[PDB]
């Protein structure tokens, strides 16, 4: 239950960066990021609003790796909460344990980070956890189990994290490879390319 | 249609006459073809429609379109039927299932074979 094809094809389909590779190189260096995949992938089709909605949904899924059925659960729960639904949807999407680890730069790509979680390498609040979809709470302190604190991948990813913008709501300490989910990240704390309102619109069909 | 007329006569609603009566909510039914025959349409349209008269376990005799590309059926051939209505057929509200119960597994199909029971060919 996880997509395992090539990565860039998605970005080339969704026509943007998705941080699907470690980032040591630029995307165009590795693909035709400007142009969709496939034989007809060169031509620019005349899509629809519905097409827009779907294409934005598949984006936020793919950028996070949630399959379909597990996703709308997030939504169907996100709508149940208070505040702007589509807003807090991303908020809890920002709560997936792996993503936090990835945000904490222990893993270059989320999948790499996900493999760590799945491979029993991370303890939230001292106790081990290995479900990637494990939601996290404020003040939680993830960490690296010593059986992996010497892994070559974790140090290299930490050396790649500062090449990207240091997240605010969560604070890390790369010295001993453990950080703190201080605050629930806000909408502005995320990017702006995401159109959460149409993501709601889609499921509200 | 004033309220005082509703209290003396509440609004009714006609029932949903099942377009698939011979199924009685059964998603499928087993049946035996009591006749096999094909029918061509009028002069302008030239085509062949495969269809069998089949008596069901419930006792009904109906018409079910033969899925096509598998035709091994004749009198006293049992067969499982499902409710599907094809345009251009007046009384055919049922489609014979293809891939079970005395229906030939159609010749190799690389596409949409599950809708014909063809198993994944192991190269």
């Amino acid at each position: 239950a996880r997509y395992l094809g090539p990565k860039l094809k998605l970005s080339r389909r969704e026509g943007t960066d998705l941080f699907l590779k470690s980032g040591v190189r630029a995307i165009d260096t590795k693909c035709k990021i400007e142009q969709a995949p496939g034989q007809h992938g060169a031509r620019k089709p005349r899509l629809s609003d519905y097409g827009v909605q779907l294409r934005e949904k598949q984006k936020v899924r793919r950028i996070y790796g949630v399959l379909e059925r597990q996703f709308r659960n997030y939504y169907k729960e996100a709508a149940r909460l208070k505040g702007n639904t589509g807003e807090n949807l991303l908020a809890l999407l920002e709560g997936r344990l792996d993503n936090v680890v990835y945000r904490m730069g222990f893993g270059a790509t989320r999948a790499e980070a996900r493999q760590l979680v799945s491979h029993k390498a991370i303890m939230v609040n001292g106790r081990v956890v290995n479900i990637a979809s494990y939601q996290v709470s404020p003040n939680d302190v993830v960490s690296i189990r010593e059986k992996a604190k010497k892994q070559s991948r974790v140090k290299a990813a930490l050396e790649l994290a500062e090449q990207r913008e240091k997240p605010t709501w969560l604070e890390v300490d790369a010295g001993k490879m453990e950080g703190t989910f201080k605050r629930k990240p806000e909408r502005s704390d995320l990017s702006a390319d995401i159109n959460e309102h149409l993501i709601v619109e889609l499921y509200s069909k | 249609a004033t309220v005082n007329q509703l209290v003396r006569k509440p609004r009714a609603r006609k029932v949903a006459k099942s377009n698939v009566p011979a199924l009685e909510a059964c998603p499928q039914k087993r049946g035996v073809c009591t006749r096999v025959y094909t029918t061509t349409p009028k002069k302008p349209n030239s085509a062949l429609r495969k269809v069998c008269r089949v008596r069901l376990t419930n006792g009904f005799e109906v018409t079910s379109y033969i899925g096509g590309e598998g035709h091994n059926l004749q009198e006293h051939s049992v067969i499982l039927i499902r409710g599907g209505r094809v345009k251009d057929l007046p009384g055919v509200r049922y489609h014979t299932v293809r891939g079970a119960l005395d229906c030939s597994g159609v010749k190799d199909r690389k596409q949409a074979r599950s809708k014909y029971g063809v198993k994944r060919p192991k190269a």
């Binding site: - | 309220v3 005082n4 509703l6 209290v7 509440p10």
Partner: protein, 80 residues
């Protein structure tokens, strides 16, 4: 304080008992229009002392017949 109803007899053709018809004004379930509903009864007319139409007052009691379960308690108008 005892409970009681205040109906109106419609018949007394039977020995020492009467047929009181209550009248309850109820709002329709769905259509919202208020309506008046009656609940006939079989009240034990002790002494056989009520005419027709004369509005009465009754009270529930242990069974006294196959039908009756109600005792008259007074008359509030005697059938002008």
């Amino acid at each position: 304080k005892i409970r009681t109803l205040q109906g109106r007899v419609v018949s007394d053709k039977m020995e020492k008992s009467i047929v009181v018809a209550i009248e309850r004004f109820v709002k329709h379930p769905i259509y919202g229009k208020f309506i008046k509903r009656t609940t006939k009864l079989h009240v034990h007319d002790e002494n056989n002392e009520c005419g027709i139409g004369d509005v009465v007052e009754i009270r529930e009691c242990r069974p006294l017949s196959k039908t009756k379960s109600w005792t008259l308690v007074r008359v509030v108008e005697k059938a002008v």
